[PDB]
Structures are given as structure tokens and as C-alpha cells.
Design a protein around this motif. Structure first.
Motif, PDB file in Angstrom:
ATOM      1  N   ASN A 112       3.642  -1.255   5.853  1.00 13.46           N
ATOM      2  CA  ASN A 112       3.880   0.088   5.269  1.00 13.46           C
ATOM      3  C   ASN A 112       3.575   0.138   3.764  1.00 13.46           C
ATOM      4  O   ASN A 112       2.883   1.042   3.238  1.00 13.46           O
ATOM      5  N   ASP A 113       4.136  -0.798   3.008  1.00 15.24           N
ATOM      6  CA  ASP A 113       3.981  -0.709   1.600  1.00 15.24           C
ATOM      7  C   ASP A 113       2.544  -1.021   1.118  1.00 15.24           C
ATOM      8  O   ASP A 113       2.033  -0.365   0.194  1.00 15.24           O
ATOM      9  N   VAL A 114       1.894  -2.006   1.696  1.00 14.93           N
ATOM     10  CA  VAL A 114       0.545  -2.364   1.236  1.00 14.93           C
ATOM     11  C   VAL A 114      -0.495  -1.279   1.627  1.00 14.93           C
ATOM     12  O   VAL A 114      -1.472  -1.167   0.931  1.00 14.93           O
ATOM     13  N   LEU A 115      -0.191  -0.495   2.655  1.00 17.22           N
ATOM     14  CA  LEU A 115      -1.104   0.616   3.103  1.00 17.22           C
ATOM     15  C   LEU A 115      -0.839   1.886   2.354  1.00 17.22           C
ATOM     16  O   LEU A 115      -1.493   2.914   2.632  1.00 17.22           O
ATOM     17  N   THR A 116       0.127   1.845   1.404  1.00 18.40           N
ATOM     18  CA  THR A 116       0.394   3.086   0.640  1.00 18.40           C
ATOM     19  C   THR A 116      -0.839   3.664   0.000  1.00 18.40           C
ATOM     20  O   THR A 116      -1.590   2.977  -0.690  1.00 18.40           O
ATOM     21  N   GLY A 117      -1.031   4.983   0.231  1.00 22.81           N
ATOM     22  CA  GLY A 117      -2.159   5.653  -0.460  1.00 22.81           C
ATOM     23  C   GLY A 117      -3.477   5.529   0.287  1.00 22.81           C
ATOM     24  O   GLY A 117      -4.476   6.032  -0.178  1.00 22.81           O
ATOM     25  N   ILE A 118      -3.484   4.767   1.385  1.00 25.93           N
ATOM     26  CA  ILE A 118      -4.790   4.542   2.096  1.00 25.93           C
ATOM     27  C   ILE A 118      -4.770   5.429   3.344  1.00 25.93           C
ATOM     28  O   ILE A 118      -3.867   5.355   4.172  1.00 25.93           O
ATOM     29  N   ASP A 119      -5.796   6.280   3.430  1.00 25.48           N
ATOM     30  CA  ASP A 119      -6.056   7.216   4.446  1.00 25.48           C
ATOM     31  C   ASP A 119      -6.208   6.529   5.803  1.00 25.48           C
ATOM     32  O   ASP A 119      -6.781   5.453   5.849  1.00 25.48           O
ATOM     33  N   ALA A 148      -4.041  -3.853  -5.239  1.00 27.04           N
ATOM     34  CA  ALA A 148      -3.281  -3.210  -6.358  1.00 27.04           C
ATOM     35  C   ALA A 148      -1.880  -2.928  -5.906  1.00 27.04           C
ATOM     36  O   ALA A 148      -0.917  -3.092  -6.731  1.00 27.04           O
ATOM     37  N   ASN A 149      -1.710  -2.522  -4.639  1.00 26.41           N
ATOM     38  CA  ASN A 149      -0.348  -2.232  -4.129  1.00 26.41           C
ATOM     39  C   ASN A 149       0.482  -3.496  -4.180  1.00 26.41           C
ATOM     40  O   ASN A 149       1.724  -3.463  -4.426  1.00 26.41           O
ATOM     41  N   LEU A 150      -0.186  -4.596  -3.914  1.00 28.29           N
ATOM     42  CA  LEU A 150       0.536  -5.886  -3.927  1.00 28.29           C
ATOM     43  C   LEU A 150       0.817  -6.341  -5.336  1.00 28.29           C
ATOM     44  O   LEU A 150       1.844  -6.953  -5.573  1.00 28.29           O
ATOM     45  N   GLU A 151      -0.126  -6.112  -6.231  1.00 25.91           N
ATOM     46  CA  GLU A 151      -0.077  -6.670  -7.595  1.00 25.91           C
ATOM     47  C   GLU A 151       0.826  -5.814  -8.438  1.00 25.91           C
ATOM     48  O   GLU A 151       1.530  -6.318  -9.283  1.00 25.91           O
ATOM     49  N   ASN A 152       0.834  -4.517  -8.153  1.00 23.01           N
ATOM     50  CA  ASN A 152       1.832  -3.594  -8.674  1.00 23.01           C
ATOM     51  C   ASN A 152       3.162  -3.657  -7.877  1.00 23.01           C
ATOM     52  O   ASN A 152       3.809  -2.634  -7.653  1.00 23.01           O
ATOM     53  N   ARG A 153       3.580  -4.856  -7.468  1.00 22.64           N
ATOM     54  CA  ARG A 153       4.931  -5.066  -6.888  1.00 22.64           C
ATOM     55  C   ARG A 153       6.063  -5.387  -7.892  1.00 22.64           C
ATOM     56  O   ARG A 153       5.837  -5.932  -8.985  1.00 22.64           O
ATOM     57  N   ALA A 205      -2.776 -12.434  -1.029  1.00 21.14           N
ATOM     58  CA  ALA A 205      -1.708 -11.622  -1.707  1.00 21.14           C
ATOM     59  C   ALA A 205      -0.765 -11.073  -0.629  1.00 21.14           C
ATOM     60  O   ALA A 205       0.462 -11.054  -0.818  1.00 21.14           O
ATOM     61  N   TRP A 206      -1.306 -10.613   0.504  1.00 17.34           N
ATOM     62  CA  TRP A 206      -0.465 -10.016   1.532  1.00 17.34           C
ATOM     63  C   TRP A 206       0.422 -11.117   2.158  1.00 17.34           C
ATOM     64  O   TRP A 206       1.651 -10.963   2.291  1.00 17.34           O
ATOM     65  N   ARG A 207      -0.171 -12.247   2.501  1.00 18.17           N
ATOM     66  CA  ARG A 207       0.669 -13.354   3.023  1.00 18.17           C
ATOM     67  C   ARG A 207       1.707 -13.875   1.996  1.00 18.17           C
ATOM     68  O   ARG A 207       2.806 -14.285   2.392  1.00 18.17           O
ATOM     69  N   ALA A 208       1.401 -13.812   0.710  1.00 18.04           N
ATOM     70  CA  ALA A 208       2.388 -14.218  -0.343  1.00 18.04           C
ATOM     71  C   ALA A 208       3.543 -13.262  -0.305  1.00 18.04           C
ATOM     72  O   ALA A 208       4.714 -13.652  -0.455  1.00 18.04           O
ATOM     73  N   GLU A 209       3.212 -11.977  -0.179  1.00 21.08           N
ATOM     74  CA  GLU A 209       4.268 -10.953  -0.180  1.00 21.08           C
ATOM     75  C   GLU A 209       5.174 -11.083   1.076  1.00 21.08           C
ATOM     76  O   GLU A 209       6.391 -10.994   1.010  1.00 21.08           O
TER      77      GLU A 209
END
Ligand SMILES: [Hg+2]
Ligand SMILES: [Zn+2]
Ligand SMILES: [Zn+2]
Ligand SMILES: [Zn+2]
Ligand SMILES: [Zn+2]
Lengths: 137, 137
Positions: free
Chosen positions: A109-116, B132-137, A12-16
Motif C-alpha cells: 500500500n505505502d510504496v504504491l502511493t501516488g501510482i496509477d 522515492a516513496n521508500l526513501e521518503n520514509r 529498498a522494498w525488501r529493506a522496508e
């Protein structure tokens, strides 16, 4: 199926990233070769680059022909005792790599949103042990 | 480069599974299609299977021709209102899937060596949020 969750998240991350990079016309893995060249200080051999980019050698040779055709890489000797071809970026490639890194930072930045930050660190230590378990096979 | 550590760990784990499965002659992704069929209770459409296995549709069609040629899968209608082709395993495939799952369990056991159950759980929660961050894109 822990391995499946890891593969799916990675895909998913590489797709994005491939989506955010799609304007650059760097098809197949090609932008990922550039990214890896940008990130190491040494100039890799073909064997080293294939390892890290994650692709068979013959596959990388095609990817490299593409990038070389676009004047983004050269295959060069780099020492008096490193006479094999090493893959080097060109000055032409720099406005390109700058853009690719900026976009890769945006996805991170965006995929790490919400992760401590602590939990990120813990996640990385788990992944590093899995990799050592694999590499120590 | 958190994304790179995830991709590398995922690649290493799939390399190891491909190594342990290499005797079965199920080349390209083919064993990973079987594994995913074995793991869902519903019979997927081609579109669903491509999603989860992680491959473009035309790529899956070739993989499926391979497996179908070996009598491991069929493409079938599964309901009065599910007339599209769904991919189903055959009875022939069962001694095969049993072996593939046993080998996939072995790799999972070995790659998790030394990693605490709590930390595994935490690692999974981080990966689920990234997804979820990716899928909620
Ligand atoms: Hg993790
Ligand atoms: Zn783009
Ligand atoms: Zn690299
Ligand atoms: Zn084998
Ligand atoms: Zn599945």
C-alpha cells in the motif's frame, strides 16, 4: 542503467519489509521463506522453494533449520508418489503468517502511493517480458 | 504480489549477468562493486559503496579485500579535506571494467528485447516513484 534502478528499488522494498518485520526475530531471509510458503497452495520441495525465495539450496537448508527449530515448518511426504520431503507450514505458524501478510500488504500500500492502477499494470507487463526474456534463455 | 514480481525479475537479471561474467572469477558480489565504481565519477567512501551495491559494510570490507588483493582497487585519501579512505580503481582494472560493461550492455540489450522505448520509460518512472516513496520514509 535500467537493471540497477530495478535492483535498487527491489532492495529498498525488501529493506522496508525487513524493517517492518524486525520485531518477529526472523533473521536472514527467514520471513521470506514463510511468506512464500503462505502464498503457494502446493507444498514445495526444497528445490522449488529455493528457486522462488531466490537463494541457493544449502542456504535454504540453514534457513529451514531455523524455522523448523521454531516449530514453524515441517519437512514431510505429501503423496503416495511424492515421497520426497515437502516443506509444510504448521498450525503454530498461522498467527505468524497472518501478521507477516498484513505487514507485507501495508508496505505494498505505502510504496504504491501516488501510482496509477494503469501504470502499475503497464509496469508489471514490462517486468513480465523481461523475466520471460531471461527465462527463455 | 507486485514486490515479488520486481524481486524475481531483478534476481533473474543479476543471475544472467553473473552467468555472463562467470569466467572472470569475480565471485560473490565482487563484479558488482567494480561495476558501481566504474559508473560513478566520484570515488566513494566504503559507506557510499555499500549503500549502492546493496550490502552491509562488513560484507563490503571482505569483497573489497578480494578486489584489493587482485590489484583492482585501492583505498586512498582524495582531498586535503577528504582524508577518509575512498575506493579507487586502478589502471589494471580498466581492461576488466571495459569487459564487464560490454557484457552488462549485452544483458541489457537482450533482456529489453521486444519492450517499447516508451514503455521502458514509463516502467522507470513507476520504479522511481516507488523508490522515492521508500526513501521518503
Ligand atoms: Hg516497471
Ligand atoms: Zn518489527
Ligand atoms: Zn512463492
Ligand atoms: Zn563467463
Ligand atoms: Zn553505483
Amino acid at each position: 542503467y535500467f537493471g540497477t534502478l530495478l535492483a535498487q528499488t527491489s532492495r529498498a522494498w525488501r529493506a522496508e519489509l525487513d524493517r517492518r518485520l524486525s520485531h518477529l526475530g526472523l533473521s536472514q531471509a527467514r520471513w521470506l521463506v514463510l511468506l512464500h510458503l503462505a502464498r503457494h497452495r502446493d507444498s514445495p520441495t526444497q528445490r522449488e522453494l529455493a528457486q522462488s525465495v531466490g537463494v541457493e539450496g544449502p542456504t535454504l537448508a540453514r534457513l529451514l533449520d531455523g524455522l523448523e527449530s521454531q516449530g514453524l515448518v515441517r519437512r514431510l511426504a505429501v503423496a503416495e508418489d511424492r515421497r520426497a520431503k515437502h516443506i509444510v507450514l504448521t498450525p503454530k505458524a498461522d498467527v505468524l503468517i497472518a501478521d507477516i501478510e498484513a505487514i507485507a500488504a501495508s508496505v505494498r500500500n505505502d510504496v504504491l502511493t501516488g501510482i496509477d492502477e494503469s501504470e502499475q499494470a503497464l509496469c508489471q507487463q514490462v517486468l513480465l517480458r523481461i523475466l520471460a526474456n531471461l527465462e527463455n534463455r
